[PDB]
Structure formats: C-alpha cells, structure tokens
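Supplementary material to the annual report.
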Amino acid sequence: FTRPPAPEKMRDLDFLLGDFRAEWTNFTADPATTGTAAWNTASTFHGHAYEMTQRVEAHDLTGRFVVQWVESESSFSGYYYDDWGNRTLLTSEGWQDGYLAFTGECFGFLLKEQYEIVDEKHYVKRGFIKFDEGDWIPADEVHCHREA
Amino acid sequence: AEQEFTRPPAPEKMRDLDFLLGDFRAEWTNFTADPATTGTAAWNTASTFHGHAYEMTQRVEAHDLTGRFVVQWVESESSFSGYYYDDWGNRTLLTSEGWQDGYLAFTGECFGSFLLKEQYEIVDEKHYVKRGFIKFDEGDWIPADEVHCHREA
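Predicted assembly:
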C-alpha cells in the first residue's frame, strides 16, 4: 500500500496551526489571576496528528495537546499531558453551533475544553468543570492571538 | 544540585520503564505476513516533560513509517498508559498493570474488534524484546510480531 492521507476532518482543526500568544484568565483562583503563554500548534505525522505545545514561562510549565480524528469512533481525540504530571484524554464530536468542545472525565469531575474561532488571527479556549450533576463552572479563558 | 522547585517529580513507577531508554537497533519479525517478513528499524526512547512521559520513536524506513509511543504512569488508575500513533493513521490506547512474572504487558482494544497485547521482557542491560499478540473473542493470544531491540546509545 501507500501512506493513507490524513483525514479530511483535520480541516476542523486548521485554525489552531501556527504560533499564538495566549492571554489567559484563571477563574479557579479567587480573585481571578491573569497571565500569558505561548500556544504553538504544528501538523505532525503527515497531518494525522496536530500537536500543540503550551509553554507558560510563568509557572515553568510545558504541556502538549495531541489531537487526532478517530474514524471508528466518529470523534476527535485530544490527549493532554505536561511536566507537572497533569494528564487528560478528551473527545469531541466536532464543531457544533459555533463551538468545538472536548470533554472527558478527570481526577484532580467532568472537564470541558471549548474552542471558539474569533477571526483569522484569534481563537479562544474556555475551560469548564462540572461536579455530580450540577452546572458548568468556568475554570479558565485563554485568548490566542496569532504571531505566525 | 538538590535545588528542586514546586513542580512534582516524575512518579517513581517510571523506573519500571527505564530499560526502554536510549537508541536501539530493532530487528523485527512479522508473523501476520505469509510468509513471515523481517526487517530492521530504529526504536529510540527519550525521557520527556521532566520524566513524566517516555516517548518512543519507531522509525521503519523500509515501510516509510514513523510512529510514536507515549507512556505514563496514571496513579488514579494504578496503571501505565501507552498512547501509540503513527503517520499511517494507526492509533491505539494501551494500559499495563506493570511488571508481572518477568513480563510487562500493555493491552488494549483494536488499532486505527480484537484485543491487542504488546509484551516487553528484558534480556540484558542492552537488549529487550517486544512480542505483539492479538486475541479474537475469548480465545488465546496469537503471536503477531516479535522485535529484538539492541541498544546502540
């Protein structure tokens, strides 16, 4: 055989590609704290996986978010892990009603990572958590502005 | 030195995976091909993210394939997690309870139906073996491949 081309569904993730300056607000702190980070996403493995590197020079944290389309499951997979020991597997049914939401169970609840496109150089990520049944509690907000 | 910080150190369970670390010449045999096929690859495993994840690169230049195997310890599940993906669209999620009876078995469902087992054993300080198996329904494990990795760095 020949190398299978990356799935057409990866178009749904093209908005992530490039180097971004990330301005974040952390709502889990009271009062809410703010800072900056670099969120740089590249295409890897011939387009079969998009790999975001998150560098928060402030908390000396480096994280990775690997995102793929899983045809057998008809959903996107998102695998996050960092050098503070955090690790989460999220899944997303895809874009619906202006949002791209990654959800999974976690141990620190339900976690939701909701992406939104603003324009050609700006996207937003909003993180939420949910206990028991209850409602979504905002956890952070990250405004990403493209540099390259 | 003992300078430290507030980021947590990597789990001590990652010591169970230190045998993978470094650059290895991999001699593989594929039992699912008929007749069985053989070749050589490079399996290079690095410590990444301050020890919290080990990242094995599998380069099979003869098949123009590059794969990645990311392994972590998941304390909440008392298990290792293994995330495999490559530039051919394959992707599998595997888990392991750790060393048992001289083998380290990562098992999971399917690939990119069946169950899959990736089983590691140590031969000596520069030589480990990986044996891949597949199981259909509730039968036995069927040998799928065998890889001898010899450390060059």
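The radius of gyration of chain B is 16 Å.
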